[PDB]
Design a protein around this ligand. Structure first.
Ligand SMILES: [Ca+2]
Length: 352
């Protein structure tokens, strides 16, 4: 089936007529996709020649580990990323248990793409768009069960004092439907955009069952459109959490926030504040802030914090099927279903 538990509906490359290939390294993936574009006669087929499932078995722990040992030397290096440009036959990049990458995945003008079981860390090229996962002009994409990490730190002397490391899962353009789920994102300062600018508004994104720890902000930095965030575990948010801007609407349901600063907010623009519908989270009222170490701060420009913890607008009926567990259950159970090596295990109320 194609149910992603969110706005995206895709099985990626795991469809009829698909071809399975094993990639032992980054270049192997690049080579496999290149070959997947040619027909029996060596001629290119628009959108790819057939559906593809690429199982990545490479391991770049030495690169990830060396980078972690000298984080400030990363931003000035060349960015590395497997581009998935104009491949629309259906593609899946799934890492084998034990695999790892010190490069990212850049989805662009493609559709029906799935990324699973990929452990991506401490990527080089923060000053040159060295993103872990990027979804650009690509609908029906499912970023599921990955481990995206770096250091939630900003070295000095970096371009715009904001480039030590790039994003975990940036989304932009006509990536009309995307589902980001069961990802273990940690040590990331700038987690993910949902629109690249004030003018890149829209899209319907679902963030569910993601485990965020020690992340500074952008969970996501939402610009217009709809965002349904359910069953996520947000801990140690050092800057801000969901930032709803350019009149976007968010449905924040059954999440667990703890040791978070500005967990739900609308800042940095000074106008066109977005809205949120709160329900079933561990925080039910402002009295729960102290309980879960929830803190709020101000901004130089007009802003709206959920310091009242009340819905500030509405949200259309969620189109897809989804069965969220309780907030307490995500707190208790999520850390073992999210990330790589959980065999793509999903948390159901049965396990609560
Ligand atoms: Ca980026």
């Amino acid at each position: 089936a194609t149910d992603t538990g969110g706005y995206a509906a895709t099985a990626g490359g795991n469809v009829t007529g698909a071809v399975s290939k094993t990639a032992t390294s980054m270049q192997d993936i690049v080579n496999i996709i290149d070959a997947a574009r040619l027909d029996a006669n060596g001629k290119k087929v628009k959108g790819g020649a057939y559906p593809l499932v690429i199982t990545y078995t490479g391991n770049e722990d030495s690169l990830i580990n060396a980078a972690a040992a000298n984080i400030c030397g990363q931003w000035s290096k060349d960015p590395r990323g497997v581009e998935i440009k104009e491949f629309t036959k259906g593609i899946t990049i799934i890492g084998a248990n034990g695999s790892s990458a010190n490069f990212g995945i850049w989805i662009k003008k493609s559709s029906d793409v799935v990324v699973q079981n990929m452990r991506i860390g401490y990527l080089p090229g923060g000053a040159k768009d060295g993103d872990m996962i990027r979804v650009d002009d690509s609908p029906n994409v499912w970023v599921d069960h990955n481990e995206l990490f770096a250091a939630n730190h900003e070295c000095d002397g970096t371009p715009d004092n904001d480039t030590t490391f790039e994003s975990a899962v940036d989304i932009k353009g006509a990536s009309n439907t995307v589902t980001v789920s069961y990802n273990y994102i940690h040590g990331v300062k700038k987690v993910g955009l949902d629109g690249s600018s004030s003018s890149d508004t829209g899209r319907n994104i679902t963030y569910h069952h993601n485990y965020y720890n020690d992340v500074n902000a952008r969970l996501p930095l939402q610009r217009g459109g709809l965002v349904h965030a359910y069953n996520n575990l947000y801990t140690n948010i050092t800057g801000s959490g969901l930032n709803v801007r350019q009149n976007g609407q968010a449905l924040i349901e059954n999440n667990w926030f703890e040791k978070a600063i500005n967990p739900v907010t609308s800042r940095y623009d000074g106008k066109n504040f977005g809205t949120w519908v709160l329900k079933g989270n561990n925080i039910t009222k402002p009295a729960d802030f102290s309980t879960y170490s929830i803190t709020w701060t101000a901004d130089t420009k007009p802003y709206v914090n959920a310091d009242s913890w009340t819905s500030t607008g509405t949200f259309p009926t969620v189109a897809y099927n989804y069965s969220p567990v309780s907030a307490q259950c995500v707190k208790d159970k999520l850390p073992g279903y999210a990330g790589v090596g959980k065999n793509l295990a999903t948390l159901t109320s049965t396990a609560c």
